[PDB]
Design an enzyme around this catalytic site. Structure first.
Site, short mmCIF file in Angstrom:
data_model
loop_
_atom_site.label_atom_id
_atom_site.label_comp_id
_atom_site.label_asym_id
_atom_site.label_seq_id
_atom_site.Cartn_x
_atom_site.Cartn_y
_atom_site.Cartn_z
N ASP A 16 0.80 -1.24 0.00
CA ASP A 16 0.00 0.00 0.00
C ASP A 16 0.84 1.30 0.00
OD1 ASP A 16 0.95 0.05 2.74
OD2 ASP A 16 -0.97 0.33 3.59
N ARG A 30 1.01 6.82 0.02
CA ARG A 30 0.10 5.84 0.53
C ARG A 30 -1.01 5.70 -0.51
NH1 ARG A 30 -3.55 2.42 3.79
NH2 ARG A 30 -3.48 2.27 1.48
N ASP A 35 -6.87 -1.10 1.66
CA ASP A 35 -6.06 -1.64 2.72
C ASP A 35 -5.48 -2.97 2.31
OD1 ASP A 35 -6.67 0.35 4.71
OD2 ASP A 35 -8.59 -0.62 4.97
N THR A 36 -4.17 -3.06 2.20
CA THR A 36 -3.52 -4.33 1.89
C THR A 36 -3.08 -5.05 3.15
OG1 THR A 36 -1.29 -3.42 1.74
CG2 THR A 36 -2.65 -3.37 -0.24
N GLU A 38 -0.22 -6.43 5.56
CA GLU A 38 1.08 -5.79 5.66
C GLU A 38 2.26 -6.68 5.91
OE1 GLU A 38 1.16 -1.77 7.74
OE2 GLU A 38 -0.98 -1.90 7.48
N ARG A 82 2.77 11.37 4.27
CA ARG A 82 2.67 10.61 3.02
C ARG A 82 1.69 11.23 2.00
NH1 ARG A 82 1.51 4.60 5.03
NH2 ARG A 82 -0.09 5.77 6.30
#
Length: 136
Positions: A16, A30, A35-36, A38, A82
């Site tokens: 992500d 970002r 949402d990946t 992690e 980010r």
């Protein structure tokens, strides 16, 4: 209207997050709205499909001729500094590609940074319908 801008890959960091050279400055981005799992999750250590979502974002930005960033209508950086953007590799949106493979879930969405929300929920419903990766 949203517009695409050029950027240059410095380094892929997680599924992500990618570091890019943008307007002559190194910046961490970002990926908006996804949402990946992690590999660098602050609390639980390397989640299931985190390696796979990392390798997928990495192969997609590293093999691209042209990377472009597209900011949405709202704030452009989060509280960590980010950049918040849709990232495109040769015209294909990395944020959607991840969701379509079941390697990401559509995040809790915050207006006005929500322009592509419906497009991404459609791909998530297809990856879920196909029982892919996260959804198997």
């Amino acid at each position: 209207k949203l517009h695409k801008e050029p950027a240059t890959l410095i380094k892929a960091i997680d599924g992500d997050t990618v570091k890019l050279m943008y307007k002559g400055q190194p910046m961490t981005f970002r990926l908006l709205l996804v949402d990946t799992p992690e590999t660098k999750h602050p609390k639980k250590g390397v989640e299931k499909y985190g390696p796979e979502a990392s390798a997928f974002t990495k192969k997609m930005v590293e093999n691209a001729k042209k990377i472009e960033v597209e900011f949405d209508k709202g704030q452009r950086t989060d509280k960590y500094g980010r950049g918040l953007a849709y990232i495109y590799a040769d015209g294909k949106m990395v944020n959607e590609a991840l969701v379509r493979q079941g390697l990401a879930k559509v995040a809790y969405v915050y207006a006005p940074n929500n322009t592509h929300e419906q497009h991404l929920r459609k791909s998530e419903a297809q990856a879920k319908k196909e029982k892919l990766n996260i959804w198997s």
